[PDB]
Amino acid sequence: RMCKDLKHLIYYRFNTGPVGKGPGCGFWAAGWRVWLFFMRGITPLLER
RNA sequence: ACUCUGGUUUCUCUUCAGAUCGCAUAAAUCUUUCGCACUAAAGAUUUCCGUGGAGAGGAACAACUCUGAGUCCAAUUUUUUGAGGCCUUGCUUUGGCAAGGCUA
Numbered sequence: 613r614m615c616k617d618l619k620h621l622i623y624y625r626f627n628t629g630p631v632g633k634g635p636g637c638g639f640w641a642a643g644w645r646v647w648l649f650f651m652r653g654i655t656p657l658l659e660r
Numbered sequence: 661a662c663u664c665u666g667g668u669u670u671c672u673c674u675u676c677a678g679a680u681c682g683c684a685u686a687a688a689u690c691u692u693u694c695g696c697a698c699u700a701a702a703g704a705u706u707u708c709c710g711u712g713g714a715g716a717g718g719a720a721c722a723a724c725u726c727u728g729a730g731u732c733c734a735a736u737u738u739u740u741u742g743a744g745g746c747c748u749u750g751c752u753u754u755g756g757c758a759a760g761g762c763u764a
């Protein structure tokens with residue numbers, strides 16, 4: 613849900629101006645952060 | 661204005677760290693609370709991601725910038741003079757002292 617949140621955060625700043633709707637936005641650092649912080653927590657679970 | 665420290669980088673270990681150890685943020689478990697728990701909150705513990713400090717060990721090139729330490733004044737106002745000489749008493753430790761008056 614959080615990554616979708618960040619998509620809504622990023623796209624609606626990305627798709628302003630002459631940029632319209634479309635699949636061209638990639639500012640991937642926010643979601644990539646979120647999934648790495650998930651990997652931080654489940655690394656010792658899957659390791660155990 | 662002459663001389664002796666201390667370096668910096670990197671790899672690793674050990675210990676302390678409730679300090680935004682992290683200008684970022686996970687997960688598990690337990691307990692509590694209400695719902696009726698991914699869509700929910702509290703408290704606590706733990707594990708992870710991965711820090712600062714100190715100590716130690718290796719190995720790479722810099723070695724005295726830095727942090728330190730050991731290492732030109734005679735004219736009013738101070739350090740280039742108002743300084744020296746005479747008289748009375750108390751005692752003379754008979755050398756003279758103390759006070760006052762002087763004279764320059």
Ligand SMILES: O=P(O)(O)O[C@H]1[C@H](OP(=O)(O)O)[C@@H](OP(=O)(O)O)[C@H](OP(=O)(O)O)[C@@H](OP(=O)(O)O)[C@H]1OP(=O)(O)O
Binds near residue numbers: 619623627632633634
């Ligand atoms: O917000 P979501 O439910 O996750 O859906 C979004 C949304 O589509 P909808 O508006 O129809 O809901 C975006 O559109 P806008 O928010 O801009 O209006 C669209 O982005 P673009 O239209 O700008 O391309 C995006 O597509 P994507 O994330 O693939 O870029 C799409 O996500 P979905 O792929 O899940 O439909």
